[PDB]
Amino acid sequence: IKPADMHRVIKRKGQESFNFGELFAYTKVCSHLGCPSSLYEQQTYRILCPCHQ
């Protein structure tokens, strides 16, 4: 994450300490049907899965 946007980060309960500064790590497996949700839009910080959008 760009630091100018790190104030916008909302953290999940029980995962408040999973990032190392600006670097977050998520699964690359969609929670819907298991396709690789592998489209990272940086200016919206949106992870997109092409199998079902």
Binding site: S38, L39, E41, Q42, Q43, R46
Partner: protein, 223 residues
């Protein structure tokens, strides 16, 4: 260069200040700051013709360039010197390297493209749609330096591929694979846009099935 920097500034002050603030800090709700983007970002934005923009929307589309190669170089020098950041790979004669950027390993470039790039355009870079009005464009009509600087400076909703995330040899392999996929003719016949089963089904319904039904109507009878 004093002449080069002055020409870059005199181009920038009549093409970019209304959105970029005339001191390269962004205009609040027109454009972002231009400190640190560098010659590579300027080259990819202008030589593609995306920039100057005209409307604030989901995505600024590619257009014919608004300047020439020398003017793009002057603007890149201006923005680089006022800030500082990545540069375009140059050639032995002062221009930007085009054939030199074409890598050797095309299988590795293909693997890297499919891991990093094909997720947003497609297998062969034919383009793909994004969330809200945005999309990843077709890569066919883009020379190697544009590909390299698009990897190097992710413009908008493109992840930024630094020189250590994607090394220059990796970047050249990806450039080589992209150019090879753009320039390769289809072997099975007419490539139906390179998108897969959707144009195939449309062709079957509009050519094969139409011809089959017409032949049935010719052979059979009405009433």
């Amino acid at each position: 260069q004093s002449a080069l920097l002055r020409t870059g500034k005199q181009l920038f002050e009549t093409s970019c200040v209304s959105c970029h603030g005339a001191n390269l800090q962004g205009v609040p709700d027109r454009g972002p700051s231009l400190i640190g983007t560098g010659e590579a970002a300027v080259y990819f934005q202008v030589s593609t013709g995306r920039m100057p923009a005209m409307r604030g929307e989901a995505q600024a589309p590619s257009k014919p360039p608004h300047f020439d190669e020398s003017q793009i170089d002057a603007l890149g020098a201006y923005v680089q010197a006022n800030g500082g950041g990545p540069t375009v790979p140059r050639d032995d004669h002062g221009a930007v390297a085009q054939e030199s950027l074409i890598g050797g390993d095309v299988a590795r470039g293909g693997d890297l493209f499919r891991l990093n790039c094909a997720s947003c355009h497609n297998f062969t870079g034919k383009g793909g749609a994004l969330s809200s009005g945005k999309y990843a464009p077709d890569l066919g009509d883009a020379n190697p330096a544009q590909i390299y600087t698009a990897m190097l400076t992710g413009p908008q909703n493109m992840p930024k591929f630094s020189d250590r995330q994607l090394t220059p040899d990796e970047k050249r392999d990806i450039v080589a694979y992209v150019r090879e996929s753009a320039e390769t003719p289809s072997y099975g016949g007419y490539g139906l846009g390179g998108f897969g089963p959707a144009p195939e089904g449309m062709a079957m319904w509009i050519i094969g099935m139409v011809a089959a039904i017409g032949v049935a109507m010719w052979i059979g009878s009405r009433a």
